[PDB]
Design a protein around this nucleic acid. Structure first.
Ligand SMILES: COc1c(N2CCN[C@@H](C)C2)c(F)cc2c(=O)c(C(=O)O)cn(C3CC3)c12
Ligand SMILES: COc1c(N2CCN[C@@H](C)C2)c(F)cc2c(=O)c(C(=O)O)cn(C3CC3)c12
Ligand SMILES: [Mg+2]
Ligand SMILES: [Mg+2]
Ligand SMILES: [Mg+2]
Ligand SMILES: [Mg+2]
Lengths: 487, 247, 487, 245
DNA sequence: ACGTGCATAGTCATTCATGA
DNA sequence: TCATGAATGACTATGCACGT
């Protein structure tokens, strides 16, 4: 039996846990803004074909596929993570298209795994765009049976768009969501002004990213906290819901709350008001009625007493309830396997860097593949030019190997090309098909020239990111929800 | 007559309505937590209350009364309806003048219906006699036209009809997404439940009628009673002709 | 609002429930002895490739696949059914190869879905043997997206081998498990004596199937109950565990129980004895100690007092505990969609009928496919004899449609055959490759004649069932576990 | 000698031997693993106490709240000893307390939480060497013809693989080397032959050298002061690999 | 009254960091 | 003390028929 000192054991074990949680659980990768469970769920669904071009698959199948191949953990919490990515009040840009009961902004829990179906959303398809073209590093999974992606292509700035919240060890993150169109402008500027220093870039990006854009709409009051978050990586952003005073016919004024700040539970909010009126600490309130429905959305009516001023009661609500509540921004993300607090210019730049990497890698892959097919096509054209001879040779061969070896000698060909000639069907010996082979060679050589040009010119590479991203924003971009007002 | 609704002495599972008038109030007795959750969201909270029932309801025909009253789900129903049971039944204290039973269109939903109807007929019969008991007919299909509004069907026939009509009308459906098939209330969201089972202008309800009380008493005892043989012979005798009851 | 009478509603609804439960939930199909959940789990795993020729897949994947395609119910109870099919103390011949914690004969529950892995067993592979050769009717699943089998090929008498227990409506089943080798003899006799009447067949089969063979070993006392079950479809079979008396150095005696009757919970058994001794019911017992382990199996030690007779205490255990307990046999199974209580000869005969059906259908499928291959090969041979013309024709054709249409006219060939010529690779034009087409045609035509011969001879059909089954029994058959003794 | 249950935790699968000197308590992570352990154990000398979920941090949590924790009560009750000043090693019901957790990080974390409980409430158990750590297997080599071998590290895996191939043995490339991702994946037999069979199990005895140094380390890592913990990790995680070089 | 097996998931308690 | 969100599932109750 081996002896071990408690200090050695404690230090090693706790550090090992802290580091894995930090790097591989709680905190987002800066490039795609994803935690491991997110990335693995999305890739599982992707690989399984659970895409928008097909009907929703049972969500159990997505969980089981994630669990069985990539994520060595429990089915319950994985389903929780999948569900959350499908809720429009949780994600500013949902990555999962859920079908069924996925819960509500209140205390209504999601339906169990058995009852729900799910597939990837079109934007999530942009997270995974061309992942099969060697655009990102893959590593073996938890048992080496299969490969999984270290990061997704993420063809839109997902970290900033959907934000992230995570409790790790020794640190935690809290990045708010943002409006995709605003982020795009920031990226477009970063691409155009690729040489600009950090000071200029921070100024430019802050001008275009006006502030967080929460899926729950609501209000942002003030600008200091937003500025702090972008300049420091830390900042307190004041949020508010929307209140509309209505005057009855009997002279009964009531407050109608139609929006709440980000991550405020509707039922807990109503309960909080009720309990503070039970306990009389919100006098002036006469009656609380939840007139919410699936058709009018959030609608909490707060009738106030006649000897009460509406503005006084609203301020009392701001003070003593989450009708006004602050978002504690802490822009923490994993950069190259290291946790880092980032300025807004750093977040954009690191994302742009990732996009350029993706495009260069994609281009390299396409260029390699283009060369291979061109290589084979060159073989075919040689066969067509001497078609009479090709056939006669193959005929006299005792095996296919004698036939091949001859083709090498006849047309001065590789083993790969000769094999391709051998695999050729009689179908392609028709006139238009022979011509199609010719034109195909011409096409690829043209594509190869394009591809080579891209790799040699950073200008085009940046242009590709811009144009492709722009296309995505035009199709999937939406209006701002959170309104920004001054003090 | 008016009665207070719970807002922050009634079952915890009950999502009560706001209207204090039983004549205008409705109680949706729903199969499953998921469906009950969706109903709670898609309902009209003004006039519609939701009481989700979990699992197969206890058979009051077989189980002794003391055991039945100890059952949490039965207690929830009795408490929510406000009326007593048996001799202590008082229709004046009925908290909802519409008691809609909503179960899955599948076979197990039918079973839960018979168990609820057995509870009602044995403990609270006047609710049936006075037409306060209804059966919601859930949708079976949702036709998702490419350009047009989606249509719901409550039978295979109606599906075929709506499909034929739409196609004839020049509408088109995808062969992938296409016609969604509901296998239970739990698969539906809030909107879908509203637009097929809870919207009073579109919902398909059936009012439970009681003609021959003595005949009903006998049928209930045969099907739900302790006598297996009687039940076995009844099924073998009448299952052959279940299709032709309404021909 | 439509009115509906309570009597109509009750009758219609309850009958609908009773009938589907009877035919489509609780009771086994006579041909494969499977309930819908069993059949759907096994086919899901089969179709998923979770076979013994590959490593265990996570059991969550089997559950999710079953849920998503075939069994529209909850993951929990589906996992329970899968787990049961993997327990050696539940099934006499396990159909699922489980990896991990699948529970115990006691109250130790199986591990959760996340922890366990699973695949099909070799015998389960015989349940599904050649299911892809139209050997069984398939129907659309619960939403028509895919096909599922109505019944499995079941190339061993699974109903009798593994038995079945099920509570339906108005009725229930309780078929005990049996020894595969004994069942095989019964089948072999049924095949040889295919004309024997029910009276003779019952006598023969009862002579070969000596009685149930439980996975838990133990004892069967008497022969009447067994005889009753086989002649009536109902019978009470007295079971016993095995007790071995041990003496001590002091001279104290102790009873060692190493086996228990089928479906007796080990922990409940120990608790029952404990609760009866301390209560003062089974005097003579001094001490109860469970010396069981994974290495010695069941081992319950019952130390008895000095003034106690071993057999007296053993008899008391037989009387007041499940050390002796009866199996209530009720041979209920679904026959052609109808529940029926069956004699043993009926169970064997119905199974043999199923096997003959499978073999004839398999033969039919192979015969059809053989003809198709022969048909295309004949087309190719025609092309080779006029190869110079065929190639010249395709070359001189402006399109492939012109080439095809020409081939039909040139060689007097079908469009399917002509398409095959077009799809032919230049590889197949080599000397030896031309020859293989010829020989393959000769090869297939021999196979077609064999297949036609099988269909024409019921003798061969029966012989195939015999030979193939014999091979299975030789490979997967085992010794008898339950010992049969007289009164 | 002390009575075994046949006034203790319901989750406890006690041993049969009434001698604490001969008895062992396996504190196991998870119901599944605990279930398998209960079956694969030697019921004579080995008892099983499955713990469910992350153990409460006694360094952070208030004392009264810790005593309300069902899992902590189970440990304190099963060990028989009191806590703090009311600690009496004489009532120790098992002279071997084996902590058995998954080889993964969450198992490591649960270890630190248990060791924190033990060091703060029942320190003499550590001082007198009654606390041990079971090292679970990571790999199971499934040779085609030979008996299966277990490995407790990537290195040992490579070694046993190399040795076997050199010896003429062969493995399937499908089934091949089974990798354990937790105790919950193991059956009774596997657990016995790797963590509970006393002739093959790999236990580590927790020793306590500098009590004052340990006291500080526990407070830094497990205490409420985040900053101290944050700076400690950033300071020492860089060199965690080289602690035993 | 209990076992059987296929059907009809929410609740319960911790780690961890941060701000009310 | 509470919310956040990924991490570490056993227990609870009915139907249904049948035999001790
Ligand atoms: C909520 O109802 C269930 C209950 N209970 C919980 C306590 N109240 C009783 C009425 C139902 C249960 F104790 C087990 C299950 C299950 O085991 C289960 C399963 O999927 O296996 C499904 N359900 C619910 C109704 C479908 C169950
Ligand atoms: C048994 O431990 C758990 C508990 N509880 C149950 C009551 N005692 C506490 C100690 C743990 C829980 F309240 C939720 C979960 C879960 O929600 C869960 C999951 O997978 O989502 C897993 N586990 C167990 C330890 C892994 C949970
Ligand atoms: Mg959980
Ligand atoms: Mg249902
Ligand atoms: Mg269950
Ligand atoms: Mg683990």
């Amino acid at each position: 039996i081996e002896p071990v000192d408690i200090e050695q054991e404690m230090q090693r074990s706790y550090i090992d846990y802290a580091m894995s949680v930090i790097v591989g659980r709680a905190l987002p990768e800066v490039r795609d803004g994803l935690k491991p469970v997110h990335r693995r769920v999305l890739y599982a669904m992707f690989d399984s074909g659970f895409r928008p071009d097909r009907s929703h698959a049972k969500s159990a199948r997505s969980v089981a596929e994630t669990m069985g191949n990539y994520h060595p953990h429990g089915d319950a919490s994985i389903y929780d993570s999948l569900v959350r990515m499908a809720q429009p009040w949780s994600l500013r840009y949902p990555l999962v298209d859920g079908q069924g009961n996925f819960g509500s902004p209140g205390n209504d829990p999601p339906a169990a795994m058995r009852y729900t179906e799910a597939r990837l959303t079109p934007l999530a398809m942009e997270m995974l765009r061309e992942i099969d073209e060697e655009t990102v590093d893959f590593i073996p999974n938890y048992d080496g049976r299969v490969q999984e992606p270290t990061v997704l292509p993420s063809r839109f700035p997902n970290l900033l768009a959907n934000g992230s919240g995570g409790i790790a060890v020794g640190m935690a993150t809290n990045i708010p969501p943002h409006n995709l169109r605003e982020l795009a402008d920031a990226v477009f500027w970063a691409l155009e002004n690729h040489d600009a220093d950090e000071e200029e870039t921070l100024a430019a990006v802050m001008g275009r990213v006006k502030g967080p854009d929460f899926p729950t709409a609501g209000l942002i009051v003030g600008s200091q906290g937003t500025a702090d978050a972008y300049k420091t990586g830390r900042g307190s952003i004041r949020m508010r819901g929307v209140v509309e005073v209505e005057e009855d016919s009997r002279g009964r004024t009531s407050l109608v709350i139609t929006e709440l700040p980000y991550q405020v539970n509707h039922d807990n909010f109503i309960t909080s008001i009720a309990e503070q009126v039970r306990d009389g600490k919100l006098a002036g309130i006469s009656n609380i009625e939840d007139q919410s429905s699936d058709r009018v959305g959030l609608r909490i009516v707060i009738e106030i007493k006649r000897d009460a001023v509406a503005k006084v009661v609203i301020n009392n609500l701001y003070k003593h309830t989450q009708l006004q509540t602050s978002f504690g921004a802490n822009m923490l993300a994993i950069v190259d396997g290291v946790p880092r607090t980032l300025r807004l210019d750093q977040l954009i730049r690191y994302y742009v860097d990732h996009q350029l990497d993706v495009i260069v890698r994609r281009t390299t892959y396409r260029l390699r593949k283009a060369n291979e097919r061109a290589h084979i096509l060159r073989g075919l054209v040689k066969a067509l030019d001497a078609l009479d001879e090709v056939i006669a040779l193959i005929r006299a061969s005792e095996t296919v190997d004698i036939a091949r070896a001859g083709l090498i000698e006849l047309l001065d060909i590789d083993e790969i090309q000769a094999q391709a000639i051998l695999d050729m069907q009689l179908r392609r010996l028709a006139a238009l098909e022979r011509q199609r082979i010719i034109d195909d060679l011409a096409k690829i050589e043209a594509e190869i020239a394009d591809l080579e040009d891209i790799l040699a010119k950073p200008e085009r590479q940046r242009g590709i990111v811009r144009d492709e991203l722009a296309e995505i924003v035009d199709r999937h971009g939406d209006d701002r929800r959170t309104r920004i007002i001054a003090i | 007559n008016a009665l207070v609704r719970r807002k922050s002495g009634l079952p915890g599972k009950l999502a009560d309505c706001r209207s204090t008038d039983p004549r205008k109030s409705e109680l949706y007795v729903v199969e499953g937590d998921s469906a009950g959750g969706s109903a709670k969201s898609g309902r009209d909270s003004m006039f519609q209350a939701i009481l989700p029932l979990r699992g197969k309801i206890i058979n009051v025909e077989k189980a002794r009364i003391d055991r039945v009253l100890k059952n949490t789900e039965v207690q929830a129903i009795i408490t929510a309806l406000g009326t007593g049971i048996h001799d202590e039944f008082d229709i004046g204290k009925l908290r909802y003048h519409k008691i809609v039973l909503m179960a899955d269109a599948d076979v197990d939903g039918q079973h839960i219906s018979t168990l609820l109807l057995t509870l009602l007929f044995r403990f609270m019969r006047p609710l049936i006699e006075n037409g306060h008991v209804f059966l919601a007919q859930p949708p079976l299909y949702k036709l998702k036209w490419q350009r047009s509004d989606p249509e719901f069907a409550y039978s295979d026939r109606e599906r075929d009809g709506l499909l034929e009509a739409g196609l004839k009308a020049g509408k088109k459906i995808n062969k992938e997404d296409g016609i969604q098939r509901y296998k239970g209330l739990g698969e539906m969201d809030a909107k879908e439940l509203w637009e097929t089972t809870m919207d009073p202008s579109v919902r398909v309800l059936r009012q439970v009628t009681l003609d021959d009380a003595a005949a009903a008493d006998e049928l209930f005892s045969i099907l739900m009673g302790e006598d297996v043989d009687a039940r076995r012979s009844f099924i073998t005798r009448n299952a052959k002709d279940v299709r032709f009851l309404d021909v």
